[PDB]
Symmetry: C3
Subunit: 321 residues, 3 copies
């Protein structure tokens, strides 16, 4: 049915609901076998990963590095200051050299087009470790965390309040494929990419889900089962701090926000979190799934790597989505 | 009897003589099995370590990284420039995320209070990789090196000449627990922390050992079995170079220093060494145990990790202390 | 016959034709067993490597790191910004500490004399990862790539056009030992080291091969089976960009260069490549072996490490040289 071996993972728009559910099934299987049963599964023995990071990272870095190694493989952390990329060398040449020396690449970049060049020029899987446009592997952790909390995903309403950034784009490329509704509030002038919105409208129509884009936080939060935010100033945007602090006033998630949400509301944030987007009462609430979510970055990137590099079949019963 | 699994190791003041002897016993066992018998002991297979370094390191870095990996685990080297800590993220949040992704953390920091926050907020063992206040794992290497040289430790006199810094504080938190005497000379105004001195007086009283603090190098060296020094300008103190070079004149360890020491005198230095604290004749003397000492940083951090993360029992006969 | 265990590899002038052929035989054996047969060969299990890099690297870094780990060992990446070297610590002391903590060192340096100090002061193998004077492990990859292309090496003419740098010096220390001829063109004032040239004349005489040094690109290319170039501005020489761009005009390798070469001509470049030394038509030609060559950096550094640290014997039939 689902065949993911050898594929790239640059964005969730290139994946069906069934393929993304397969990745969450494998995540749950690997988490059960290793975290709960204590098995050692050397599924990536004799394999290596090239990790290119052009931006800082705590969770993507740790989850990917300890995750690849936990399956018996060798992760190699490469930064801008150590390798030749950009300066003495082109991306086409870097891509061909990585192909012959590693079995896959995870790259945290600025330009999504750099991930496209890497996928075209390399003959090994390229995984997006976050770009300015999309962050697909974050949403894998998010939807596994919500399936574990609610015991299913179909019919949940996701309520985004914040910037029209990479995280919202990845939710837009995937929520309807799971039968989930999306209500998203951004400041005026900080909307999601018109092309992404257009494709999210199509997915909503195909799956019979709702998509609401607004500038009002309480309209996005109304009836939502999950409240979701992120920093107002993403990496590479620090020059705009002053303008963004002014434009985003009134967009902090608080218990006033939650009062309008469904009674079973929970909260997500990809982290790192700052005091601006959400207050401490919601961030550290018993309803906040932020640290479960962060943990699931590890079991989901392990599943991505196993599905793109092996023919391993999940032993676990498929979770209810 | 001794149970160390799950504990943090932030300072040796939180450890009894019997617990620290257990760590040196395990070090000796692991050194004998792997270095001498050539066994491969995958005791930390399926485990990972988060290594946070806010300061430079050659020995703590190499001993910890090659040591964790030699036992089958995966070490992950994280610096200030790569992870979000300090800048985009709090230590509480970093601590909770590390907990769900690694099995332990070793952190070389400035503030000991940062290690306290990490231990309180993480549910996994936190090991001090050096702070401004204490460096417990250095003293583990030091006392293993002296037990190997002398075939026991009880009744030795340690003679510190130098700054009232982290290394002297760690010796003060541990020497009396082994029945060792301490005679320490620092410049006036560069004494050890009054709280540490107070607690070292109490340990000396409980164990019936002597504690002498002086400003005279030859008084500290008199009758000492081990001469010990370190840099006059510790990491983070480079602004004070001029004032310290002036204040520490006359505190260089030389053969004049050694003439006053016991006939079986040896020499220790945690490294890196500069020409100021000790001359070449003592540093490279046959009595200098500096490079044995540096090697034992590896077998002792391996023992720390095995004792805090497993239920492994030493097969070796307990060494005489 | 050949015994390489415990030796350093600082330059190919310290190696006979038979010893270098042994290293290419082991490379071919390891490539066949692991890449083609898919075997997992944990030959360096329980071993570690200290990797000191004072300059940037993509290929030496990846090939060495994934290569050491593919054989079951642990590679440790150490940079100038993380370890004490240069600043708080001497190379003699760093060398002795590395000896007791790792099983070998690979170091990419500026001064070849730093590699000499490391080899004298350490009791473990020191491998040159590139210095200003020599880059021996590059030529191992190059000659394996040419043996795979041509099915033998004896009698080939290597045609260097470019700077009288580390790569040309390493070709000069080795081509005649394989019965290969060398014709090399550099700009006036940018010749190879007079001592290296002198020793290359002696090797040419002992092996009955030709050695031609010229300032004319087409004289170096005439009748050559392999065209070889590299950057005009090596790492550490960026201050000389203006003077070198002017002095090296007319030294770009093009199809005009190739028109003069033997009919079976191929092309090599150690990478990273810039547009100055060679054009796109030659670089991306079907005759360009640049990306095969880059891959073989991995199988040859694996063979170096296995031959200096173990008693493993190649199972493969010896390749024809
Ligand atoms: N919009 C934010 C998203 C950060 C995602 N965070 C993570 O993936 C967690 P990490 O940075 O610790 O790996 C930005 O682009 O800056
Ligand atoms: N008082 C000194 C102690 C240095 C300890 N050295 C070590 O642990 C050896 P390393 O720095 O190579 O890891 C200071 O605080 O600067
Ligand atoms: N003459 C050049 C040689 C570069 C060698 N390149 C390599 O070894 C490939 P890498 O730098 O990606 O490891 C110089 O000294 O700059």
């Amino acid at each position: 049915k689902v065949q993911l071996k050898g594929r790239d993972l640059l964005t969730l728009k290139n994946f069906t609901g069934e393929e993304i559910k397969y990745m969450l099934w494998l995540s749950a299987d690997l988490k059960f076998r290793i975290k709960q049963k204590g098995e050692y599964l050397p599924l990536l023995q004799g394999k290596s990963l090239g990790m290119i990071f052009e931006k800082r990272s705590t969770r993507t870095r740790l989850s990917t590095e300890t995750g690849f190694a936990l399956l018996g493989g060798h992760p190699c952390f490469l930064t801008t200051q150590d390798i030749h990329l950009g300066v003495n060398e082109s991306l086409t040449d870097t891509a061909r050299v990585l192909s012959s020396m590693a079995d896959a690449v995870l790259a945290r970049v600025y330009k999504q087009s750099d991930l496209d060049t890497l996928a075209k020029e390399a003959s090994i899987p390229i995984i997006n470790g976050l770009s300015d446009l999309y962050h697909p592997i974050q949403i894998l952790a998010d939807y596994l965390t919500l399936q574990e909390h609610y015991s299913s995903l179909k019919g949940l309403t996701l309520s985004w309040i914040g910037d029209g950034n990479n995280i919202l784009h990845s939710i837009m490329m995937s929520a309807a494929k799971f039968g989930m509704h999306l209500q998203a509030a951004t400041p005026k002038g900080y909307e999601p990419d018109a092309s992404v919105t257009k494709l999210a409208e199509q997915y909503a129509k195909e799956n019979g889900t709702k998509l609401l884009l607004t500038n009002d936080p309480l309209e996005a939060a109304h009836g939502g089962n999950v409240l979701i935010t992120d920093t107002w100033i993403s990496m590479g945007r620090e020059e705009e701090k002053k303008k963004r602090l002014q434009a985003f006033q009134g967009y902090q998630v608080t218990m006033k926000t939650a009062k309008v949400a469904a009674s079973d509301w929970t909260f997500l944030h990809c982290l790192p979190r700052k005091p601006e987007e959400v207050d401490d009462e919601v961030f550290y609430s018993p309803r906040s799934l932020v640290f479960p979510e962060a943990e699931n970055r590890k079991w989901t990137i392990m599943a991505v790597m196993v599905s793109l590099l092996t023919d391993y079949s999940p032993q676990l019963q498929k979770p209810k989505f």
